[model samples]
Target: MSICTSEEWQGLMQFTLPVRLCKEIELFHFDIGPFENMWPGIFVYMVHRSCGTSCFELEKLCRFIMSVKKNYRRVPYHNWKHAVTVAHCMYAILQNNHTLFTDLERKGLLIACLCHDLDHRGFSNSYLQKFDHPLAALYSTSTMEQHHFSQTVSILQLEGHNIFSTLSSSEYEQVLEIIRKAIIATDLALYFGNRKQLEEMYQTGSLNLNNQSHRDRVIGLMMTACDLCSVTKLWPVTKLTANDIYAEFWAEGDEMKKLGIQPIPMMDRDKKDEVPQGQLGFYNAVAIPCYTTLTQILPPTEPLLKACRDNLSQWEKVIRGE
Candidate 1:
C-alpha cells in the first residue's frame, strides 16, 4: 500500500481549505523531522486547508507552529495525524450538512477542528496518573479538556503565532470558543454523556427541529461524529487508517518501555495476551460509530456506511479463521 510521504507533500500542497491545511501540516512535520514518524501530521495539514496562507502568514505560522514542535506528537495514540484527521473529518461533516451552518459559523467550525488537538501526547491522563509523572501533577487538578483549549488559545497569543489572526479579534474569540468546545467533545469518556442525552431526546420523541438548541446538539455530535465517521467512506482508506493508528501506538509503547516506564497497559509485550483490542476493537467502536452516525444524519452516506460495515464483518471473519 502507498503510504504518506513528503514527496506527496508538493502534490498535496494546493491552496484549498483542505490542501492548505495539509501544507501547514507538512511544514510542521519537516520542521521536526528528527522524529521518525511525522508524516501523519503532514497528511492532516494537506487535507485540511484550501490554500496555504499568504507568504507572510505562511512563514509566520510555520515558525510559530514549529516553536511548539518539541511538544508535537509526544504520544503515539493522540499524535499529529490523529489530530489532523479529526480536523479534516470535522470540516467534512459541516460541509455535508451545509444547511446547518452559516458562513461565519462554518469558519468557526473549521478553526475548531484544525486546532482541537494541538501539542497532544498520545497517552491520556490515565496513563500519566498511573506513573505519577510530573505532568500529571501539573495538570492533576486542571481540566485536561479545558487545558487543551487554553493551550490552543495561548499559542495564538505568542508573537506572530496567531493562525486565526486573519480574522477580526471578535471573530478570533468566537473561533476559540468553538475550537474549545470541539476539543472537549473529543473525550471518549464524555461519549455517554452526549449519547445518553441524544438517546433521551430520541426516546422522548421531542426532537426539536427548529432551534439553535437542536443545532448545538447537531454540532456537538458532528465534532465527535466526523472523528468516528470516516471509516464509512472508503474501506481501503479505512484500512490504511487502522494501520496508521497501530503503528503510532506500537511506537509509543516502545518509547515508554525505553524510558524505564511501563509501556501502555495493552501495548506492553508481557501483557500481550491482555492487551486491549488495538486494531480490531478501535474500528468497531470508533470507526463504525463515525460512519453510522453520518449515515443517520446524511442518508447519502448509506452506501459508504454499508461498505464500512461489510469491511468490519470481513475483518471479523478473517481474524476468527472462519
Candidate 2:
C-alpha cells in the first residue's frame, strides 16, 4: 500500500521540522517513493481476482492507460491514480452482482468502466465555461455531457487508441454503447436527482427488464454507481480517495480565484488543519449519503458501504489531527 503507515507518519513528522527550516540534504529516492505505482497495481489485482476472464482484456487495457498516464504532471488530483482507483471500484461492484447483468452486457460495462475517463483535463464542468476547448464547442453547449463522452471514444478512434481493434463490428458496437452510457453518466451537472429519475424509470416495479436492459441506461446507472462507490471502499483507501477529491476541489478554487469569483467551499489548502476537513465535510454532506442510497438498490455494493461506515470516524480523527 502507498498509504502512510504508522512508521511513515513518524517519518513525516521527523522531516517536518527540517523541511520547515528549509534545510537541504542529500537523499536517495525510496523504492516506493512515487505514489503512481500503487493505484494501477491495486486496481489490476482487484479486478483480475473478482472479474475473471470477463475482465482480463479490460484489466490489460486499463493498466496500459495507466502506463501512459505515468508521464503526466498531476493537475492537483484528477490524475491517473484516481482514475484507476475509480475503475477498480466500479469493476468490483458490478462483478459482485452478476445477477444484475447478462454476460455480454457485463463485458461492455467492464470495458466502459476502464476507459471512461481516459485523459481528464484537471478541470470541472464549470471550468469549461472559461475556455474555448474543442470539446466545449463541439456540442454547441447543448450536449456537454455527450461531448465529453465523445472525447473518450475519439481517443480510441485515434491510430493508437484502438485498444480493442480486434473485436468484430457488432461486438465493437455493443462495447461502445455500454462505454458511452457509462462515461456519459459521470456528468457533475447531473446530481442525485438524476439518479433517482433513472431508478424510477428503470425499476417501475417490473425488474426493469425493459428499461434497464437498454445498454445505455444500464451502463449509465452502472457508471453512476461506480462514481458514487467511494463511500463503500476500504476506509483507508476511501480517506486517500477523499484527499484526491479535495485536491481537485482546491484546484478548482484556485481557478475561481483567477476569475475573481468567490470560492464555494473555501480555499485554504495551505493550512493543514483547515484544508482536509473542509473537503471531508463536503464529501460527507454531499457524496456519501447519495451513494449510500445507491448501495441500497445495488446490494452488491453493501460491502463498500460497510467500508464507508467503518472508516468514516477514523478518517475524521486523521483529518482533525486527533
Candidate 3:
C-alpha cells in the first residue's frame, strides 16, 4: 500500500561508482545495458557532484529517485531502466555543454528526465482514453505527461524527500516550472510543434538562449531529444532498444485486442518485422528534423545528429533487405 518505509528508503541511499565507470558513462550513457542495475546510484552521484548538493539533500534525492523508479510499471520499455537512461542522456548533455544552461536549469532538466515517464502503464494516450483511464479523463491533452509531473510532485512532498529544500522559495518554484515544461515536452505530439519553432529560429539565426521563453522552449526540445535518444545511438544500441520498444507496443496491442479493438499497425505483433521501417519513419518525421534543429543551436551536439544519420542509413538497408 505504501511506497517505501523510512528504513527501506534510507537503504536506497547507499550509492557509489568508480571514476573509470563515470568516464565510461560520459562516453556512452545512452546504452542502458551497461548501467542497467547501477543507474540510480550513478544519477545521484552525478547530481551531487555537479551541483555540490549536500549529503543531506543527496540522501533525500536518492530515496526519492528510488521511489520513483519503484513506481514505474514493469513494462518492456518504459521501466526504471529507461528512466535512468534518459536521465543519463540529460546528464551527459549537460556535462558537455555546461555553459549552455544555468546550474538550476541543469538540475531541473535532469530531474524532469528522470520522472518524465513515471508510472507509465504501457499504453499510449489514445489507448488510455479509449479504455477510460482516469488520467486521460483528467487532462484532455498531454494526459499521461500531466500525471507524470503530478506524481513527481507527490514524491517530492513525501517526508525527507524534498531534495530542493535548500532552494529559496522563488528558486524552488522556478525549478518546478521548468520541470513542468520539460516533462510535458516528452509528448511527441508537442515535439513536432516545438521543433518547427526552433527550426524557424535557427533559420533566422536568432535562436537566443539568453531569452527566458526561448531558453525554455529549447530546453523542452532538448527533453524530447533525450527522450527519443535511442534513435541517435550506435546501431547495436539502437537495434537493442528498438526491439524493446516494439515489445512494449505489442503488449499494448494485446491489451487492445482483449478489449475488442484492433491495434494500430505499428503496435501489431505480427508486423514486428516492420520495426526498422517504423523507426525510419520516426527518424524522418521526428528525429532527423529535431536533431537537425538542435545542432543548429548547439553545434557540439553534432555527434547525436551524426549518429541518427548513421542509424537511418542502417534502417534503410534493413528495409531494402540488404
Candidate 4:
C-alpha cells in the first residue's frame, strides 16, 4: 500500500530474533508469523550484521529495506521470503571464511542476493523473450537480471536509501560494480560456462582471487551456488522447495495453455508425475556439477556438496517409488 515504511515495520527485526535464520533447515519449518511485516527485520538483521563497521546508518538502511520489500510481489516463489533466504544462504557460506571477501564486497554479494529477483512475475527469461516482453527488448541477454540490478539502483536513488552513503565515492562505485556483477551472475544460463574456469583454477591450485578476471568469475560461481543452495538443504526442505519451484513453473504452464501452447514437460502440469525425473535431470545438469566444482574450490562448502548428493539420491528414490 504505502510501499512499506520503517515507521510501522520498525520492529520486524526484533521479531526475527536474528541469526538462527541463517541455519539451512531452521528457516524451512519456522513460521514467519505476522507475515510481510517481519521481512525487513530479517533484512536489517542481515545487512546490519555484515556491514557492522558503521558504513550504514540504521534509519537509512531501514527505509531502503522497506522499499525493497514492498516492491516484491507475493509470487509463490521468488517472493521477499526467497530473497532473505538467499541472503542468509550467502551468509552461511561466507561464515566459513570471513576473510574471503572484504567488507564492501561482502555487502555487495549479500545485497545482490537479496534483490536479484526483484519484482519477478514468476516467469523465466525464455518466457519473456518468447512473448516479446519489453524487458526482452531492453536487456536482450539477461533480461530480468539486468532489470533486477536496475531496480536495486533505483532503490538506492531514493531519498534516505543509499546505505553505501558513508563510503567514499570510489568505495561506493566498487561496491556497486560488485553488486551488478553478482546480480547478473544469478542467471543460470550464464552459470554453466562460468563453472568450468573455476574448477580449472582450483585444479591448478593457483586459483588467484587476486586476478581480477579470476575474481569476477568466482563471484559469479558463488552467486550461482547460493542461488541454488536449496538443493543442498535437507531432503524435506529441498523437496518442498522443488514443489514451490514447480508451482511457479506450472502457473506459467497454465498461462501457456490459455495461449494455445503445450508446455514442456517440466512446465506441464500434465507431466506432474515426471517431476522427480525432471529434478534428477536438474541435479545432473546443474546442481551436481555446480556444487561439486564449488566444493572443489572451497572445501568449507562441502556441506553444500554433501547435502546436494543426498537430495539427488532422494529424487532418484522418489522416481523409483521406493
Whose lDDT is greatest here?
A: 3
Model 4: colliding residue pairs: 13-41
Model 2 scores a TM of 0.68
The C-alpha TM-scores of every prediction are 0.66, 0.68, 0.94, 0.91
lDDT of 2 by residue, 262-314 (tens): 66554435544675566467467645555565565666566655665555666
Cα error, residue 34 of model 4, in Å, equals 11
- lDDT of all predictions, in order shown? 0.55, 0.54, 0.82, 0.80
- After superposition, candidate 1 runs with Cα above 4 Å error: 1-71, 74-77, 134-144, 163-170, 209-213, 233-240, 247-265, 270-287, 300-304
| Model 3 worst lDDT run, 10 consecutive residues | 1-10
Cα deviation in Å at residue 277, candidate 1? 5.9
Query: How do the residues 1-322 of candidate 4 rate in per-residue lDDT, one tens digit apiece?
Result: 2255556436542355444555522232232323455566666665666667365776677777777887788898888878877877777667675698899888888888888998889999998988888899998989999999999998888877788888999999999999999999999889988997787778889688889888899889889988887787767767877888999999999998998988888889888988888889999999999989878777787877888889999999998889
List model 1 lDDT by residue over 220-317, tens digit each.
Answer: 77777655544544555555555555555666677778878676656555554432345468667765665565466555545546766776776676
Q: List CA RMSD, all candidates.
A: 7.6, 11.1, 1.8, 2.8
- Score residue 242 of candidate 1 by CA lDDT: 55
Please provide the root mean square deviation of candidate 1 (C-alpha atoms, Å). 7.6
